[PDB]
Design a protein around this nucleic acid. Structure first.
Ligand SMILES: Nc1ncnc2c1ncn2[C@@H]1O[C@H](COP(=O)(O)OP(=O)(O)O)[C@@H](O)[C@H]1O
Lengths: 788, 789
DNA sequence: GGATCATCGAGGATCGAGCTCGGTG
DNA sequence: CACCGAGCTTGATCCTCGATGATCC
């Protein structure tokens, strides 16, 4: 090993060292001319992650530095790979003037690209939330906070237990997860993506309160109703500090925080969320999910918002009623609204780039286009007699000042980057128009010169061209090169051409580049100026984008409710579910022939249903569709049924069927209430004769008589059909099956009472089993059936 | 839409539409300068499959032509993406010089890259078989053939029924599958990859017999013992014609064909193959598979061969005994052999590229390196008292003539491609040495000219460089450019440099170019010449590579047997399995908590074992370890046990682990199982009601015991079936106990006689932390029902 | 029909600062 | 005796020649 003390290294490597010292463990994109160079294990790692060239740079103090570098103009395709990989990156830039820097130029880490704090369009997934979360454990319980950097949506929670925390982890699904060093239950977290171990002092309450009050500009957090959540504030404080470190600027879009209380939303355990296949089927794909069907939103921001609504069913009936009324009122206006809403696009993530001062020309172009739709939206909504519509129409705003600003400032279709100019429009700044006049005098001036010089010289091959390196020139063919006027000054020789410069041309070249340099520098002044003019209205713009997004969701759900023939569910104060011709919203759309609709009647006098009938009969589907109907009822959406009356639901507990089973069941029985919805799916793996059955008789008895939760208890055990005999508030239903020889047809139709027989025989007869074996099974069944 | 008729297009585009007509449905890599361009539908699909630039050609024919292209020197990495997606590609090349062609230059489809016919190293997966297969359906039965284009392994079969065909499909797992137009049961092949629909006349017997006899140079196929397989020959005939069509070349490595007979191999259905996790766990991954553990072979060729052996367990006792004896004789020699075998590498797929005349420089280098190891292998095997070892040592050969040839011909480490020459070594060819001596003697002249011109001019920045377009030049800095001698003729100006030429430099440039062009052209003559000298010994080299591959498998299994402490299984004439301290070969290695070994006694007096107890990955494992032990016993390998006696096994049925799929697998077992069959039933009847599930399991257990009399390990939760041994003979009760003590449970993976006498679903629920009232309710209600039993 | 005129690919230096060597006045 | 003036150091990016075919009045 060579001696690598601070003094022995070169001045640029010493500058790299202290910047790298403030980011020891993450890759440092070090701006070096036109290339973000990395060094040592950052270069060799970058080389392996990005598939780029690992070169080296000569050092005079032992080890030549392992070097890997990326052009500043191709940096995003390599960050895309890293951000996909759950990798944090600090972007160091050249700041100062090279002409007045004898040693290394002034450099700064201006932003850290992390998997939960990315705003750039190309890095993010169009229709997926990308949330940066913080978790924190105490002796008492858990403290949690999630921030959508690209909307400024910062939410909080204090999960009571380990099981609730695992349900919140799965619900939110953080892209980057900050956790404290004294975190005990590592089993919840270890193996999750974007895992960042941080010190304890980052989770200090006094620093958190100060930082959050400062950010919101409030005296206390009484206004937000999070003053009495010290656990959740500790997480939010660590998160905000991390967010202001990954940007090293103010986050003005973060003006508010809301608490997601246990009684505010329906708490669905990890199994339920997976079993219902909300945004993720059990295989991990996005096909045959509740999102894929319900999500026909015309904006990605609405897509996420609807997907956000699906993840968290709201229990506040007032919000739900307003959505139900709205969906009903807008159902007639969908055709006219959707094509207008479609043009708005992803305005949410554009405002994030405005707030972070990272917005690109076409972000401002789409924002301008979004404002141009507001009048047509305001016009089409004015007649809709609905208080919530008029509330979101007022919240929508106008922004006539900002609409005029962008219309004057920016051209119709600017390029991707301001770097190469041509973004600010003509008339806005008449100094800029003057600087451009010289730059765009080339079409006539240099063409006029070409004619004069061609006619004057009498060299027919004479043509005026430009070259990025050498600048402008007069080009003559090799054959006619020696005949050039003596006033022509040799500049560039080519294989079959000679390129010259004349006093009038070098005057032009000197002035056309100094004009470009001025025009370009002023454009970037006027560009950074637009942020100064737009940031003050960010509050109104966020509420506007939030209102437009919410409109897209409810216009979509209005389209879906009409197209797929859904109805409005009504609410009662006490527990119960009365469905009439209820369907599975996903399965009926994916399988291309009519799904068989079924009713439901759950009440305190009829709270448990013992569901018999054959497997692959849609027994599991019927219980799922109920939870999905309950989900969609408590997102404020219309439901796939002819009629639904539903009571308050605090939790949905689902067990689909070993160790994990009995564990999930125990969690259900402990934490379930009368208001809880329970779906038991033939849960049982008995290690003896009735070991499984005996447990399902005692679990069904407990749920019915002790907890008294609304339950759909699907079971293959035929002995459980004797529970209604001895237990009150327990009833038998079954999915009918029709035997017709060596085959069986599944009706998928729920009937009262227990199924006439079991169909293990029928399934075996369809397997094509020898007749003596079948006749033996029919004989031996009647022997054992005789025992009861 | 604008008219794209044949006449309106350019002669070049007409030449594309000519050759594209002979390949209507597959992507055509059209060589266009230094780019394999595609056009119209081919360019937009390629753009979407490869993630390349979809560009356009300015045309005289209406719609501007959708164009997508890849450089000729980068073709492979893009073919890799296509052939692993199951995409066939025709590679069209420029053959003539375009400058002396009045119309478009003469072009040719030299090879078709198809998923089952890839010869190139980069396209193939190192340690996975890539079979081109042909299937046909007849009024009589099924006809099948598989070709490993790389190994020269040509196989055929006439699967007995629909079930055997599905088992053969899954076993072979063809990369490309040829099937006839009158193929009825499409359900067998419905979702399979690389599906090619072909006409029926390609499956004509007289054409097949003629083509196969021609290829092997035989009068009849009596020699191969495939003369009385008309169905299998029809498939093989269509397959050979397709293989010749894809290469457009003779296949001299295809000299032999072997039949996969029904009585030669243990028939395992698709479920068994998946459930045992041989090369593929149920999740589809390569981890916790029999291959991943047993495959410590030092060559990919050996890796595939061992993997091929695992897929097809042989019943010929003579082959197994030779492997068992060999593995035993190699045990003490392993340490010295494996590092030598490791250097051989993938010689099998290299010989494929030799036979197809597609071999790349480093393929010839690794072949030379493989020959250099033969003497050391032959030396270390010399004393091994084993007829099969000495048989494979003789079959190995020497090739001292070919070893010397390649040592003289080719340099130590050539580049990846012949394109830029520098492959043929100095001394081999006196003409080559002359063409290079001029190329390097000009290089030293032009370096000496740099010194002369530097001293003469007095310009310190003066530097002699080279450029593909310009050739050579003299480079001076912009500051010192005007001081250049007047005889210096400016050619190229740069930002801070000027490049010149003199008649003395272009005299020397004329020598370097003519030296290059001749040296390069002659190198490719001497390169194509090496194939002419090597092809004649291909038969001996295939037998050599086959012997080396087989040695690597048996050296590996000898290493594994010694390292993992396996023993040699002995065979009896009638069915039975007597294991002493048998282990699961995978699970014991993956979990570093020491595995609990157990015996087995299956016989006609003890055919069915009713296995009770908590499963906890010890009941399913115990049944699967038996099938794996039976697998490894009939691959000729040592087995994870202290002693094993095993009888003949014709099939292995595993319904271990949708309830409809279970009853389907079970139905297939009961229909086709014999006394020689091994059956593993894992708590079937789970999904349907208490009584109906039990009723089926009773009927199935009674049928298997009394009617079929197959060797069965019948795992169940149903405790009523533990009364079967009371009634009838050849049925016995065993169980895995668990020991309750406080707030913990010890799950014993140790097999005991009799039926389990306790419930532990209560105990596991009590550890889950279930309320005691619910537990006591379950125990209360159980004792009410169990006391009546 | 024959000088004239597209068109796609191949290299290729540059982009641009920074450290190091090399004179150098 | 410091101080200018050269070297080369990652993937895009024009840029121009190469090589070729196409052209059409
Ligand atoms: N009510 C229904 N109408 C039509 N098809 C249905 C219905 N219920 C279920 N199915 C179909 O049957 C399949 C099996 O349903 P599932 O609830 O999984 O059955 P089980 O739990 O009995 O195995 C579903 O994928 C769906 O395609």
């Amino acid at each position: 090993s060579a001696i690598e003390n601070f003094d022995a290294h070169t001045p640029m490597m010493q500058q790299y060292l202290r910047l790298k010292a403030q980011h020891p463990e993450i890759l440092l994109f070090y701006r070096m001319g036109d290339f973000y160079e990395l060094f040592y294990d950052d270069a060799k790692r970058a080389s392996q992650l990005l598939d780029i060239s690992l070169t080296k740079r000569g050092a005079s103090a032992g080890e030549p530095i392992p070097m890997a570098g990326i052009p500043y103009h191709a940096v995003e395709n390599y960050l895309a790979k890293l951000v996909n990989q759950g990798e944090s990156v600090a972007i160091a830039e050249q700041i100062g003037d090279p002409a007045t820097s004898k040693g290394p130029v002034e450099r700064k880490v201006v932003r850290i690209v992390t998997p939960g704090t990315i705003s750039d369009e190309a890095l993010l997934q169009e229709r997926q939330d990308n949330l940066l979360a913080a978790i924190w454990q105490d002796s008492k319980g858990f403290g949690y906070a999630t921030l959508d950097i690209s909307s400024g949506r910062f939410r909080l929670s204090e999960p009571a237990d380990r099981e609730t925390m695992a349900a919140e982890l799965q619900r939110t699904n953080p892209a980057e997860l900050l956790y404290a060093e004294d975190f005990a239950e590592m089993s919840l977290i270890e193996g999750r993506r974007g895992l960042r171990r941080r010190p304890l002092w980052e989770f200090e309450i006094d620093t958190a309160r100060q930082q959050l009050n400062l950010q919101f500009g409030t005296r206390d957090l009484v206004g937000f109703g999070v003053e009495n959540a010290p656990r959740g504030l500790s997480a939010a404080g660590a998160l905000l500090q991390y967010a202001k470190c990954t940007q090293r600027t103010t986050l003005p879009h973060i003006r508010s925080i809301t608490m997601e209380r246990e009684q505010d939303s329906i708490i669905m355990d990890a199994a339920t969320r997976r079993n219902l296949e909300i945004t993720q089927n059990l295989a991990g794909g996005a096909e045959n999910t509740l999102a894929s069907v319900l999500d026909s939103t015309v904006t990605p921001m609405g897509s996420r918002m609807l997907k956000r609504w699906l993840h968290m069913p709201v229990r506040d009936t007032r919000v739900l009623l307003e959505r139900q009324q709205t969906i009903g009122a807008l159902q007639d206006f969908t055709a006219g609204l959707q094509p207008v809403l479609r043009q708005v696009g992803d305005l949410e993530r554009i405002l994030a780039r405005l707030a972070l001062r990272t917005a690109r020309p076409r972000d401002l172009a789409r924002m301008r286009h979004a404002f141009q739709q507001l009048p047509e939206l305001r016009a089409q909504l004015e007649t809709v007699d609905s208080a919530p519509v008029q509330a979101l129409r007022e919240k929508m705003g106008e922004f006539a000042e900002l609409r005029d600003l962008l219309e004057r400032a920016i051209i119709d279709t600017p390029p991707v980057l301001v770097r190469d100019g041509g973004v600010i429009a003509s008339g806005y700044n008449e100094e800029l128009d003057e600087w451009r006049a010289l730059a765009d005098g080339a079409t006539d001036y240099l063409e006029r010169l070409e004619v004069r010089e061609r006619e004057r010289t009498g060299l027919d091959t004479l043509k005026v061209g430009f070259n990025a390196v050498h600048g402008y020139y007069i080009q003559i063919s090799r054959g006619q090169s020696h005949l050039a006027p003596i006033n022509y000054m040799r500049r560039q020789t080519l294989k079959n051409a000679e390129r010259y410069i004349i006093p009038e041309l070098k005057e032009y070249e000197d002035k056309v580049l100094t004009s470009k340099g001025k025009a370009l520098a002023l454009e970037k002044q006027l560009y950074e100026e637009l942020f100064d003019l737009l940031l003050p209205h960010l509050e109104a713009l966020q509420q506007s984008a939030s209102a437009l997004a919410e409109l897209d969701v409810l216009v979509n759900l209005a389209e879906r409710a009409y197209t797929l023939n859904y109805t409005s569910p009504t609410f009662i104060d006490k527990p119960g579910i009365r469905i009439t011709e209820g369907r599975h919203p996903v399965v009926e759309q994916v399988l291309n022939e009519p799904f068989i609709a079924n009713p439901l009647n759950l009440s305190p006098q009829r709270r448990m249903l013992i569901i018999t009938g054959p497997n692959m009969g849609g027994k599991s589907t019927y219980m799922r569709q109920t939870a999905l109907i309950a989900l969609m009822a408590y997102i404020g959406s219309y439901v796939p049924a002819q009629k639904v009356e539903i009571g308050p639901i605090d939790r949905i507990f689902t067990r689909v069927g070993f160790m994990v089973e009995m564990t999930e069941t125990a969690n259900i029985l402990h934490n379930a209430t009368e208001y809880s919805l329970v779906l038991m799916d033939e849960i049982g793996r008995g290690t003896s004769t009735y070991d499984g059955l005996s447990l399902a008789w005692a679990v069904a008895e407990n749920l019915a008589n002790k907890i008294k939760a609304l339950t759909l208890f699907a079971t293959h055990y035929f002995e459980l059909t004797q529970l209604p005999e001895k237990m009150e508030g327990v009833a038998n239903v079954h999915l009918d099956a029709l035997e017709h020889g060596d085959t069986i047809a599944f009706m998928h139709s729920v009937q009262d009472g227990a199924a006439s027989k079991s169909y293990g025989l029928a399934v075996a007869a369809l397997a094509g089993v020898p007749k003596e074996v079948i006749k033996r099974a029919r004989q031996k069944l009647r022997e054992l059936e005789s025992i009861s």
